[PDB]
């Protein structure tokens with residue numbers, strides 16, 4: 596625990612970042628993870644951390660966010676890392692390369708990253724076969740409280756966005772415990788305007804119809820993942836459509852195209868989505884707002900700048916049933932997962948909660 600926590604944070608990771616640019620480090624990390632070349636994950640999840648939501652049991656509330664394992668190559672290594680659930684993607688229907696390099700940038704002074712990957716993806720067919728090869732193993736993992744999510748994107752040249760997502764539902768829906776309709780990527784022109792009302796209702800109506808057409812045992816929950824950069828009108832509209840159509844949950848939030856005042860990193864003006872610490876409270880506030888607009892009736896996965904138990908608990912109290920992290924992993928390495936879980940459990944006891952479930956939305960009941 597604390598030993599290689601400090602070793603990874605003070606020595607290992609800083610040395611990795613000195614040797615490798617962000618995208619190279621990302622690639623290597625995916626390789627190592629898929630091979631199980633990880634530190635020992637000694638933290639044992641207590642019953643306090645268990646959550647039941649989205650039609651599943653989650654043995655702990657800390658997931659790996661979409662974008663790390665884009666093509667489904669490292670899923671088992673990620674469970675080994677200690678994540679209570681794993682989300683792969685975004686996956687696009689056809690293979691595509693994404694934007695030209697460089698397309699990932701570190702802001703060390705801000706504990707932040709900026710990326711404009713642009714949905715680089717092996718495509719549905721490759722990922723489908725990848726997941727099929729471990730399908731029964733995943734079934735046991737899920738039954739064991741370790742669910743799998745799949746994040747669906749759309750091709751850059753795609754003429755019909757709803758049809759791209761419908762394809763993803765048909766191909767990967769049968770292999771996922773939940774699907775994410777990602778209408779919040781900063782890095783595909785036009786995508787985020789799928790977040791407007793009548794266009795979103797049409798989009799999500801088609802997604803849900805395709806989902807309902809799958810056989811029962813293979814029918815995933817469907818979640819919508821939104822940006823932190825929405826107007827009050829956007830959020831209000833999304834909340835309304837989500838409740839009207841019976842969307843199963845929200846993921847809040849993606850990266851931000853904003854650049855908060857105070858960023859110090861030399862690369863702060865690179866185009867792309869900003870993640871990590873500068874995003875943290877913007878994300879938490881968006882969770883707070885969406886939870887209230889949905890009357891606490893729509894499950895929320897909270898994401899954005901989580902690197903400690905306090906960060907996680909603040910999102911849970913704000914209305915998140917589950918949280919994810921990504922950027923924190925790039926700075927502190929695999930030990931950050933056990934760290935977050937251990938601190939979350941301590942804070943829960945400290946504040947008088949019997950478990951995570953009791954803390955969900957607790958700020959709204961004060």
Ligand SMILES: Cc1cc2nc3c(=O)[nH]c(=O)nc-3n(C[C@H](O)[C@H](O)[C@H](O)COP(=O)(O)O)c2cc1C
Nearest residue numbers: 660661662684685710849870871899900920921922
């Ligand atoms: C390098 C990188 C790539 C990402 N790729 C995706 C993606 O493909 N699909 C998606 O829905 N979110 C993607 N994200 C967003 C993350 O899932 C997450 O919402 C965001 O980074 C905020 O969490 P964080 O501060 O813990 O990193 C990406 C983020 C980063 C840093």
Ligand SMILES: O=C(O)c1ccccc1N/N=C/c1ccc(-c2ccccc2Cl)o1
Nearest residue numbers: 617620621624627628633701924925928929
């Ligand atoms: O480095 C970036 O700026 C970066 C940018 C974008 C995405 C990921 C990024 N780095 N990720 C590093 C990482 C992940 C996992 C491990 C790791 C470390 C040590 C042992 C085992 C493992 Cl799996 O290192």
Ligand SMILES: CCCCCCCCCCC[N+](C)(C)[O-]
Nearest residue numbers: 618621622690691692715716717
């Ligand atoms: C199959 C068409 C080409 C898709 C390549 C997508 C990237 C695969 C490797 C992921 C890690 N990365 C390249 C982002 O550093």
Ligand SMILES: O=C1C[C@@H](C(=O)O)NC(=O)N1
Nearest residue numbers: 712713714780782850868
């Ligand atoms: O959803 C996404 C897509 C990703 C990319 O550019 O591939 N970049 C992000 O920050 N969020």
